[PDB]
Subunit: 371 residues, 3 copies
Amino acid sequence: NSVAYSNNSIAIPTNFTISVTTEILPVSMTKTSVDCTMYICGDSTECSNLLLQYGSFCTQLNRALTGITQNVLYENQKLIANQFNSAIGKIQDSLSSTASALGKLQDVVNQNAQALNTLVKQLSSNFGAISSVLNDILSRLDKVEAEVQIDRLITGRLQSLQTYVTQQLIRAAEIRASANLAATKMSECVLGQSKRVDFCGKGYHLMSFPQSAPHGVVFLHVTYVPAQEKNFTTAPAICHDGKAHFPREGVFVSNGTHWFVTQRNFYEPQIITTDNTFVSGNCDVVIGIVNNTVYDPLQPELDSFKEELDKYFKNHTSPDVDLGDISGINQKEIDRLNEVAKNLNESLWPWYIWLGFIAGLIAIVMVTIML
Amino acid sequence: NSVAYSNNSIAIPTNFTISVTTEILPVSMTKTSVDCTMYICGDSTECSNLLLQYGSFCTQLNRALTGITQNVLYENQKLIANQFNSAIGKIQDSLSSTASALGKLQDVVNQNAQALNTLVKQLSSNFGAISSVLNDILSRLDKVEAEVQIDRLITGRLQSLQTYVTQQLIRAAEIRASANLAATKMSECVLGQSKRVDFCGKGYHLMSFPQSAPHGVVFLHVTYVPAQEKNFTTAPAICHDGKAHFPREGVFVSNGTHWFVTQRNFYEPQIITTDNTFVSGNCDVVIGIVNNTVYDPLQPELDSFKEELDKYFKNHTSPDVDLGDISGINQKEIDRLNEVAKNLNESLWPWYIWLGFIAGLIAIVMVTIML
Amino acid sequence: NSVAYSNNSIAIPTNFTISVTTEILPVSMTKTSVDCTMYICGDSTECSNLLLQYGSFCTQLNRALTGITQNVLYENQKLIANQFNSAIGKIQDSLSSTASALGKLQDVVNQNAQALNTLVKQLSSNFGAISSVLNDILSRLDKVEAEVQIDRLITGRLQSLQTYVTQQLIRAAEIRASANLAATKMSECVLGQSKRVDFCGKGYHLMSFPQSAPHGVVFLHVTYVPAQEKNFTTAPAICHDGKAHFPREGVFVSNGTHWFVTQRNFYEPQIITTDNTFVSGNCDVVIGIVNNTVYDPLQPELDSFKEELDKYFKNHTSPDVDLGDISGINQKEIDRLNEVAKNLNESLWPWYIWLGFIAGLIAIVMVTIML
Ligand SMILES: *[C@@H]1O[C@H](CO)[C@@H](O[C@@H]2O[C@H](CO)[C@@H](O[C@H]3O[C@H](CO)[C@@H](O)[C@H](O)[C@@H]3O)[C@H](O)[C@H]2NC(C)=O)[C@H](O)[C@H]1NC(C)=O
Ligand SMILES: *[C@@H]1O[C@H](CO)[C@@H](O[C@@H]2O[C@H](CO)[C@@H](O[C@H]3O[C@H](CO)[C@@H](O)[C@H](O)[C@@H]3O)[C@H](O)[C@H]2NC(C)=O)[C@H](O)[C@H]1NC(C)=O
Ligand SMILES: *[C@@H]1O[C@H](CO)[C@@H](O[C@@H]2O[C@H](CO)[C@@H](O[C@H]3O[C@H](CO)[C@@H](O)[C@H](O)[C@@H]3O)[C@H](O)[C@H]2NC(C)=O)[C@H](O)[C@H]1NC(C)=O
Ligand SMILES: *[C@@H]1O[C@H](CO)[C@@H](O[C@@H]2O[C@H](CO)[C@@H](O[C@H]3O[C@H](CO)[C@@H](O)[C@H](O)[C@@H]3O)[C@H](O)[C@H]2NC(C)=O)[C@H](O)[C@H]1NC(C)=O
Ligand SMILES: *[C@@H]1O[C@H](CO)[C@@H](O[C@@H]2O[C@H](CO)[C@@H](O[C@H]3O[C@H](CO)[C@@H](O)[C@H](O)[C@@H]3O)[C@H](O)[C@H]2NC(C)=O)[C@H](O)[C@H]1NC(C)=O
Ligand SMILES: *[C@@H]1O[C@H](CO)[C@@H](O[C@@H]2O[C@H](CO)[C@@H](O[C@H]3O[C@H](CO)[C@@H](O)[C@H](O)[C@@H]3O)[C@H](O)[C@H]2NC(C)=O)[C@H](O)[C@H]1NC(C)=O
Ligand SMILES: *[C@@H]1O[C@H](CO)[C@@H](O[C@@H]2O[C@H](CO)[C@@H](O[C@H]3O[C@H](CO)[C@@H](O)[C@H](O)[C@@H]3O)[C@H](O)[C@H]2NC(C)=O)[C@H](O)[C@H]1NC(C)=O
Ligand SMILES: *[C@@H]1O[C@H](CO)[C@@H](O[C@@H]2O[C@H](CO)[C@@H](O[C@H]3O[C@H](CO)[C@@H](O)[C@H](O)[C@@H]3O)[C@H](O)[C@H]2NC(C)=O)[C@H](O)[C@H]1NC(C)=O
Ligand SMILES: *[C@@H]1O[C@H](CO)[C@@H](O[C@@H]2O[C@H](CO)[C@@H](O)[C@H](O)[C@H]2NC(C)=O)[C@H](O)[C@H]1NC(C)=O
Ligand SMILES: *[C@@H]1O[C@H](CO)[C@@H](O[C@@H]2O[C@H](CO)[C@@H](O)[C@H](O)[C@H]2NC(C)=O)[C@H](O)[C@H]1NC(C)=O
Ligand SMILES: *[C@@H]1O[C@H](CO)[C@@H](O[C@@H]2O[C@H](CO)[C@@H](O)[C@H](O)[C@H]2NC(C)=O)[C@H](O)[C@H]1NC(C)=O
Ligand SMILES: *[C@@H]1O[C@H](CO)[C@@H](O)[C@H](O)[C@H]1NC(C)=O
Ligand SMILES: *[C@@H]1O[C@H](CO)[C@@H](O)[C@H](O)[C@H]1NC(C)=O
Ligand SMILES: *[C@@H]1O[C@H](CO)[C@@H](O)[C@H](O)[C@H]1NC(C)=O
Ligand SMILES: *[C@@H]1O[C@H](CO)[C@@H](O)[C@H](O)[C@H]1NC(C)=O
Ligand SMILES: *[C@@H]1O[C@H](CO)[C@@H](O)[C@H](O)[C@H]1NC(C)=O
Ligand SMILES: *[C@@H]1O[C@H](CO)[C@@H](O)[C@H](O)[C@H]1NC(C)=O
Ligand SMILES: *[C@@H]1O[C@H](CO)[C@@H](O)[C@H](O)[C@H]1NC(C)=O
Ligand SMILES: *[C@@H]1O[C@H](CO)[C@@H](O)[C@H](O)[C@H]1NC(C)=O
Ligand SMILES: *[C@@H]1O[C@H](CO)[C@@H](O)[C@H](O)[C@H]1NC(C)=O
């Protein structure tokens, strides 16, 4: 089911008013080349310095936009003397042995102290080197942790700049088409006279006059709009006994009883003629179908982030450091000596009788002589 | 060499069938604004959190799409006594000296032990701090190593999202042009009648009827297609004696002997007239050349990656740590003493004869008295 | 103020020359699919390996482009013996005590040496682990510091590749429109004859002949250009007593005294008639204004980098490491002993007279006997 022979009330102009139309068309586009430094980063120093590492894409993007008883006592004397002498010998040996052992102890202790001092020096050097290296690590750590975010924001603003570039290229591709439309509107209407409805001025084109504009052209079309029009029932064809008679460069204005081939753009009824109407056969209407399907582009569909990530993403986690736990590396006699020191500090007739006998003997001799 | 005066067999319609054409044109486009979170990252948490750092480009991209024998013994006694006394003095001095030296050794050893304990404590604090700091370093190391890859995939999907945006802007720029074509097809054919071939319905336009569609317009053009046509040899001009006579709004259908100015769209031969043909001079054909060169944009050519990289890329490599190598910091007498200890443990008449003589003397005196 | 009734000198053709126009139109575009590996990174290995982490955007971008005196002496003997004995006892006790204390010192010193060796071993293990871990840290540090710059350049070249993609989609969207123009130029001019000025060949179209081209179509339009034309003063309408008479499919060539409705495309003056001119009322000119405003897209304006940065940017700075400063962990008697050692090395009649008396007594007895 379609609509061919049906006569409906369509307006046919009974009259016109002269008219003019001022039609503006942009024909050129300013080359809006873009500074990406100010656009993406602008005044912030770190992102500006990072943009330098983003290459010359900037000019590249501008590339798009710039175009487009005497004996025993003597024996005891010898005894005490020899005991004392042997004692002296063992004291001297005790002394020598104790001195040697004490010196070896004083040696090993001082060697332990020397090892302590050398270990202290070596460990101090170790700790200085470690502090320096780990400080360098943490400092460059913080710098990288900042710069990765600054670059992430730069990358996210790159998408905005590229959307800007894309929309600008779109606009310039529309500009060149509007310039071609300007060219043909100049051709068909300033050099000539357009026969098409509303083309080159509202109504029907009589004349055109071109004028320039900073990026466009304006046409003053003197035309005529229909001052008055009347709705006549009209059939683009009428089928008489199986033969389709359809007007020749006109329309079947249906009069009260007759069909006239009137002018489409003016009420001027003119009777059906085979010179006013072409004739067909079989009363058959060819049905056409047209769909101007504008191109639908192949949009870039992606996987979900997890699949495209774990495809290459390695989830490497470095281990907790564990290092060696050095925490697991664990007078009475002097009194006796001093006591024995202080303790060692602590334990540090015949002639007369015989003479009397001799005197008595002499006395007796004297008495005997006296008698 | 071109083709002007040559008459070739071109079809001229002997007849027509009435016809209708249903012509669909999309006039509007849905604003397919895009969520970038679901598009790029979707459900994965880490990339979603990272997208927050990518700025509001999302809305920005939507911005595009929402628009668009007694004396000697006494002397020896004195000797042993004085020897013993002097020995005692040297024993006491040996004792005092050994005690002082032994106490100094016991002091320095305990000082070495104290230094050991203090060094152990200081080193334990050192190792705890180092473990904590390097664990922090390695942990944030792993996190950054993951996030840089997650952001790399985000950045690579940003290109897909921007290609989507670009293709959508392309499609909308085609949509607005199809809407303008819809406007002119309404104008020249519903308000009027198109004179152009196949424009507004297959064949030749008789009438049009517009109807809307969710994003388009459909025109029912009642037209006429040529039911029958015959191939007549035709010359767009014929040059009689150096003067080019070319039909006036018609074509030179070459009859068996004559040229007729027939209607282009219908076989209706009509004899050459100067009202049927314009006349030229010199038989000269102007040759025109036209190339509608669609704009070829300035594509953003780049250097190779090495030149744009080493331009700013610094290949800094931190050195291998080297730190101090602390690995390079390297009884007989007691027996004699004990032996001498245990060794030191080990070496810890006249009256009668004279009385007999006196008795003999008294005996003699008695005998003498008896005589 | 506009321009309707004013008659200006416009050229009307007095004559024509036959002509031909060779019109080339590109109708198809080669699918310039792009390898992103060679484009962005090319031959450099590290950026190539990094591109693998950028996902399959490559094909996605191709998705766009592929489409689109005896007793005292004895007492002194006992004295020296007991003094010596007690001295021996205190020497033995001094010996035992000194030996025990010296052995305890030799024990504690060797324990200090053992603790030194164990601490050395534990610290060597600690230093080896620390060196390994911090070397790993610094090495992956340098690698990440290089890769972030390589990826930054990749991301900056992604913008160039996307600008290329956008411009290519622009070009293909122009290609399909040029193909539609080719379609209509074939329709209205090879199947028919164009009535529009310069459309399908310079001048006025007589015939067209289509021919293919690797991505285009060329039409040979036999047309006629105006050989001669004369500038006649012309008014698209003239207002007689308030009624606008404007020519019917012609122009008012202003003769010396009269207006003729001449053919626009040929000097053929024909007198004003109501069949040559439509008539209006009130002498009123309708003034129309038209501006074909090509779509200006909503460009993605961004904040300054600081606001979009500090929105999520955290300026975390890890502290300077400070670790424990281990630098803060700080014979006369033997002479006396040896002196006393060497010093200790250093201090290691009655019968005859009575017999003579007895002999004198016997001598006296002998003398007495002799008397
Ligand atoms: C039709 O409407 C247009 C708006 O959609 C508008 O075109 C505009 O014309 C002005 C003229 O003042 C332009 O303004 C500019 O002024 C000068 C001259 O071009 C330039 O040097 C400036 O940099 C600035 O761009 C507008 O740019 C222009 N609009 C657009 C979108 O380009 C007019 O009202 C009509 N068109 C014409 C051509 O007049
Ligand atoms: C369409 O039908 C209309 C109605 O028949 C017709 O208009 C009519 O035209 C006739 C002829 O001119 C007139 O007939 C009478 O005209 C005058 C009166 O005006 C008399 O003096 C004559 O003797 C004659 O009887 C009708 O008056 C007139 N009717 C109307 C309503 O205008 C159209 O001419 C027809 N159109 C075509 C193209 O045929
Ligand atoms: C990167 O880091 C996460 C580590 O915290 C990582 O997670 C872990 O993935 C492994 C391997 O898929 C899982 O190991 C076990 O997984 C299932 C769960 O029961 C078992 O059947 C397996 O046999 C295997 O033993 C861990 O369970 C999982 N851990 C967690 C906490 O999820 C993720 O892949 C990454 N994280 C992010 C946010 O991307
Ligand atoms: C010409 O062919 C077109 C296909 O190239 C197709 O246009 C399509 O029309 C349908 C109508 O059902 C649209 O479908 C949609 O349905 C409604 C109404 O628009 C929307 O709300 C939905 O979201 C959905 O988009 C198609 O979208 C549309 N095609 C395109 C590419 O837009 C028709 O067959 C013909 N055109 C018309 C206007 O009918
Ligand atoms: C970043 O890291 C690479 C280091 O492994 C770096 O490479 C090296 O570049 C230097 C600079 O030219 C070369 O140095 C020297 O080249 C020769 C080799 O002996 C000498 O005779 C010269 O006098 C000069 O001193 C190194 O040779 C080169 N490394 C190697 C192993 O050849 C690269 O620039 C970067 N690597 C990547 C993958 O981008
Ligand atoms: C109108 O001017 C065009 C230049 O703007 C140019 O079209 C060009 O035609 C040549 C033909 O040799 C193409 O060259 C190519 O050659 C073959 C055939 O297409 C291809 O396989 C090659 O890969 C190569 O592309 C040009 O590509 C083409 N120009 C463009 C921009 O596509 C002609 O001078 C005129 N047009 C025609 C259709 O002839
Ligand atoms: C526009 O005005 C022109 C000037 O009046 C007019 O041309 C004139 O046409 C008349 C009639 O053909 C000529 O009148 C004379 O013609 C010949 C001489 O050539 C005499 O034999 C006749 O008796 C008559 O007197 C004029 O000579 C001629 N003038 C010129 C300069 O050509 C145009 O015809 C007018 N155009 C229209 C459409 O009316
Ligand atoms: C990231 O690193 C910079 C650190 O070097 C950081 O800068 C510092 O920002 C703080 C926060 O405002 C400022 O702090 C104090 O500033 C004045 C100084 O006394 C006080 O009166 C305020 O109350 C506030 O407490 C620091 O002064 C500022 N650093 C310096 C040297 O001025 C920046 O935000 C970041 N740097 C870059 C390049 O982005
Ligand atoms: C060992 O014996 C001596 C002698 O009895 C004592 O020593 C005297 O020590 C006091 C200590 O103040 C001095 O004031 C005296 O001058 C010392 N005596 C002499 C003679 O000088 C004491 O019992 C022991 N000596 C010590 C412990 O040094
Ligand atoms: C020093 O000499 C004494 C006395 O001869 C000895 O000591 C005795 O040691 C034994 C060891 O078991 C004890 O059972 C005895 O009781 C000790 N004697 C007395 C009287 O009690 C030994 O040769 C030396 N003393 C030592 C080595 O302590
Ligand atoms: C203790 O006294 C002895 C005996 O007077 C001295 O020793 C002698 O030491 C010298 C050292 O060269 C030897 O050559 C002699 O052979 C030793 N004497 C004997 C008998 O062998 C010395 O004054 C002291 N002994 C020491 C210091 O060992
Ligand atoms: C055409 O109009 C006439 C009167 O104006 C009417 O009688 C006739 O039925 C109409 N044709 C159709 C097909 O409706
Ligand atoms: C229409 O035009 C005719 C003839 O030109 C005239 O008689 C009639 O009055 C006009 N009507 C209007 C409304 O202009
Ligand atoms: C090491 O020190 C601990 C402290 O708790 C103490 O018991 C002892 O002196 C050492 N440990 C051992 C097990 O010897
Ligand atoms: C035109 O056709 C006629 C017959 O149809 C023929 O005689 C003549 O040679 C043709 N013209 C040319 C230039 O071939
Ligand atoms: C063509 O039209 C003519 C006149 O209208 C007619 O005589 C002839 O039969 C028609 N031929 C065909 C094939 O329709
Ligand atoms: C340190 O230890 C080594 C172990 O090989 C051993 O020879 C000695 O006791 C020390 N080294 C030196 C050179 O004194
Ligand atoms: C039109 O031209 C004629 C002579 O060619 C002149 O007399 C008249 O003034 C012109 N009309 C206008 C409005 O200038
Ligand atoms: C213009 O055409 C006419 C008639 O065709 C002729 O008389 C006149 O000489 C031609 N003039 C030129 C310059 O061709
Ligand atoms: C530790 O060494 C310093 C070296 O300057 C020295 O004065 C002393 O032996 C120790 N320091 C103290 C305060 O005891």
